[PDB]
């Protein structure tokens, strides 16, 4: 079998869902397999994986601060580095960060970050999808 987008891969969804009438576990693919990937990467801190001390992103280190220019640049650097190292399947376009605006008192306390990405039409040497990576290389 060779379908469309097979080179992008399929995998487990997040969070894990188990069905009982259909005796199976939920599996995602293509673009959904990528979006969910991002949700994991930006919600894990750097020391939380057992033998992978470099996987994660320390965003909560920037809580309890006002959104000055020196904070926005730090957020951007962290997010860009994490995506560069751990998301080879996409291309990042821009990062939009805003504070404020709902109650104009509750709105003051939240920060909003928008991530814009596109999907590359070629494969990548850093993509561990089977069985292409046994030949595509590293």
């Amino acid at each position: 079998d060779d379908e469309s987008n097979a080179y992008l891969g399929t995998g487990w969804g997040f969070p894990p869902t188990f069905e009982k009438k259909a005796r199976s576990v939920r599996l995602v693919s293509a673009e959904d397999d990528i979006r969910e990937s991002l949700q994991i990467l930006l919600s894990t801190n750097l020391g939380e994986r057992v033998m992978q001390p470099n996987y994660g992103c320390n965003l909560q280190d920037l809580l309890f601060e006002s959104l000055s220019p020196t904070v926005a640049s730090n957020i951007k650097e962290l997010v860009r580095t994490a995506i560069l190292y751990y998301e080879p399947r996409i291309r990042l376009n821009k990062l939009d960060i805003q504070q404020g605006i709902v109650n104009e008192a509750d709105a003051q306390g939240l920060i909003q970050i928008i991530v814009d990405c596109t999907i590359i039409s070629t494969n990548s040497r850093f993509n561990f999808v089977y069985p292409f990576y046994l030949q595509e290389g590293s």
Binding site: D2, S4, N5, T81, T122, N123, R125, E136
Partner: protein, 232 residues
């Protein structure tokens, strides 16, 4: 609000373990940045002009000048009334300890990141670097010998790790797999030329996708283009 230049000092070559930061008391008036590319320039005999070949891109260079002043006429940006800068030696000390001296655990100077608020160097908001040149001039002194003004000139060079460099060069070549959709006006040899640079591979592509008649294509077909074999 006025924003100030900051220098962040790291121990990790992946820029994850921050050691410290230094903030300039007076922003520089200007700075400069330099780029260069290297080509091969050999020429054939009795030939008019040439078509040079690419060799590599060199690291970028950065030049900066600034000043420390402690005579009591430059205000301190902290909001208190009646406050002016009056200590040069402390600033020189922390600066030299942060950017120049050897680290006792790594046996070399620290990795630096330069940030100025909303400034952008390019596709990034900071400059990752190492210090290569520094000069200090002391021009005004107190009656006990302690300095009142210092002028500094610095030269930095660009730094980026191996693992990250090969990922920034996302080399796409006939070393990977391609996928293309057929639209109105497409023909197989022209698509093959546009991917491989040579139409002659068309007969192979038709076999990979199971095409009985390859001179009349349908307009919603997705075709796969495999990589080439590593050595022929």
């Amino acid at each position: 609000a006025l924003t100030k230049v900051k220098l962040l000092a790291y121990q990790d070559k992946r820029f994850e373990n921050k050691l410290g930061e230094f903030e300039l008391p007076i922003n520089p008036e200007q700075f400069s940045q330099s780029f260069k590319v290297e080509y091969n320039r050999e020429q054939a005999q009795g030939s008019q002009r040439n078509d040079p070949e690419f060799k590599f891109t060199k690291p970028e260079e950065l030049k900066l000048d600034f000043t420390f002043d402690g005579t009591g006429v430059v205000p301190v940006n902290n909001g208190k009334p009646g406050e002016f800068h009056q200590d040069v030696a402390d600033q020189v000390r922390v600066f030299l300890d942060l950017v120049y001296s050897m680290n006792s655990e790594t046996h070399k100077p620290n990795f630096l990141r330069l940030i100025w608020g909303d400034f952008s160097f390019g596709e990034k908001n900071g400059f990752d670097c190492l210090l290569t040149d520094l000069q200090i001039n002391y021009t005004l002194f107190d009656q006990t010998g302690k300095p009142l003004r210092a002028k500094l000139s610095t030269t930095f060079t660009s730094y980026v790790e191996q693992n990250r460099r090969v990922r920034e060069e996302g080399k796409q070549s006939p070393d990977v797999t391609h996928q293309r959709k057929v639209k109105a006006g497409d023909t197989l040899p022209l698509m093959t030329h546009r991917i491989y640079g040579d139409p002659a591979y068309y007969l192979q592509i038709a076999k990979v996708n199971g095409l009985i008649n390859f001179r009349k294509l349908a307009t919603n077909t997705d075709l796969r283009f495999p990589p080439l074999e590593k050595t022929q």
